[PDB]
Amino acid sequence: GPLSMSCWLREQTLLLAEDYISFCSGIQQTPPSESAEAMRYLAKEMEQQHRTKFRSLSQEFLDTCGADPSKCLQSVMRELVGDGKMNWGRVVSIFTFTGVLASELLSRGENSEGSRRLAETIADYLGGEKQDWLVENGGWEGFCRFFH
């Protein structure tokens, strides 16, 4: 059912977000899944292509958000897709931005708990709010094949 699928998509997304965030946090481990290998490559490609802008955005974000970065990230994700359209490129940017955000929070002395909250925010949004789009596009296996 829709609830069963959403729960599964949320967990699949959480694993993916947790892996990318860890990858951005100095941890070196083999990708746990083909989708993780793909996201590591694609999200770092997007960062390398816009590194200064992502860095500036992450610092502005954290300086204007305050107490709850996860809540602020939900509002950004909502505005990113605020034109009703959804595609894998926008998903990649969410991962790229959150990876830079996580790295900046670590640089500022924060614990890994904040990282986990950001991963759960991505998972809840894509696996819950965007479950229909994710399913119709084949989920993270479709993400893999779309980018060959």
């Binding site: 816009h50 974000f61 204007t64 509002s75 950004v76 990113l80 605020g82 595609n87 926008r90 940017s93």
Partner: peptide, 22 residues
């Protein structure tokens, strides 16, 4: 124009460029 919309639009434009190269 407020922060969340500013950041969302910035990410949108970078996503569009990523699609142009893919």
């Amino acid at each position: 124009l407020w922060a969340a919309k500013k950041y969302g639009q910035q990410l949108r434009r970078m996503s569009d460029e990523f699609d142009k190269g893919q």
